[PDB]
Design a binder for this molecule. Structure first.
Ligand SMILES: *[C@@H]1O[C@H](CO[C@@H]2O[C@@H](C)[C@@H](O)[C@@H](O)[C@@H]2O)[C@@H](O[C@@H]2O[C@H](CO)[C@@H](O)[C@H](O)[C@H]2NC(C)=O)[C@H](O)[C@H]1NC(C)=O
Lengths: 195, 75
């Protein structure tokens, strides 16, 4: 049996920044979801539309795995009907989302002594994101009526901002790895089935 | 919990300043954008730094800012 490569999604050595989340397409494989939903290593495992225990008897056309790193207190924004810095400018889910949001603490990986500043999120944007939209532009944001001309300075900001992840952070601002599994069923044969 | 106590107020500033980015126009918006940026920048200096006096100075400024932002939200 050709099992779906979930080990390349969860046990990945590197996760993307939330402003530029990494999408992997899962297709034409056997998807065992009882391996993840029994590990008891996840702090969050919330499924919308599909029951975690019924998940395995369903066939889909494609399954998309969107991965990124955010703060613990920001995990609540990875859900339908939410607003906030992440929900609006970095990663937006649809109100009719069908899928599972899985997250766990990576304080032993994504934190460093002196502070790990390699993770970024979008601080400013002209408008809110649409569902599953991404924006990787670094064009300088104009806060007022005064033109920036691509120059950062007074009333002109670089649109991205870093996180400060260190081992001794409070739980709310420790780093968390998030994987969102989106399940879609189209007209195509539906090649992603469980055991 | 001194370091954590300060983060609490810095986040409150960033959250309120963020909401105001969809409400305010003109100078009021520009001002809110600054405060938003300030809070998220100070969250990085809070973690990196030392000396209790620097930590308290950040808190006091953050609290003045939060109260200021609420004057924009109510109007
Ligand atoms: C993600 O990896 C964990 C751990 O895998 C082990 O440690 C790695 C560093 C590497 O050495 C692997 O080859 C090891 O297997 C997986 O958790 C294990 O899952 C197996 C199978 O169910 C179980 O027998 C082990 O006891 C689990 N170990 C622990 C510590 O829980 C986990 O399943 C992987 N995630 C995915 C989606 O594959």
């Amino acid at each position: 049996t050709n099992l779906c490569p979930f080990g390349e999604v969860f046990n990945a050595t590197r996760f993307a920044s939330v402003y530029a989340w990494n999408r992997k397409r899962i297709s034409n494989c056997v998807a065992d979801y009882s391996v993840l939903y029994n590990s008891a290593s996840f702090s969050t495992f919330k499924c919308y539309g599909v029951s975690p225990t019924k998940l395995n008897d369903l066939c889909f056309t494609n399954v998309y795995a969107d991965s990124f790193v955010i703060r613990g207190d920001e995990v609540r924004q990875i859900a339908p009907g939410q607003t906030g810095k992440i929900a609006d400018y970095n990663y937006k889910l649809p109100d009719d989302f069908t899928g599972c949001v899985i997250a766990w603490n990576s304080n032993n990986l994504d934190s460093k002594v002196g502070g790990n500043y390699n993770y970024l999120y979008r601080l400013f944007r002209k408008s809110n994101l649409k569902p599953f939209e991404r924006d990787i532009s670094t064009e300088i944001y104009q806060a007022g009526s005064t033109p920036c001309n691509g120059v950062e300075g007074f009333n002109c900001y670089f649109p991205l901002q870093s996180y400060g992840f260190q081992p001794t952070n409070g739980v709310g601002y420790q780093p968390y790895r998030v994987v969102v599994l989106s399940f879609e069923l189209l007209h195509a044969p539906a090649t992603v089935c469980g055991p | 919990e001194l370091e954590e106590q300060v983060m609490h107020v810095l986040d409150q500033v960033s959250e309120l300043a963020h909401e105001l980015l969809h409400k305010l126009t003109g100078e009021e918006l520009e001002r809110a954008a600054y405060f938003n940026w300030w809070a998220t920048e100070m969250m990085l200096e809070l973690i990196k730094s030392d000396d209790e006096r620097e930590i308290r100075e950040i808190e006091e400024e953050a609290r003045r800012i939060l109260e200021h932002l609420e004057e924009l939200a109510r109007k």
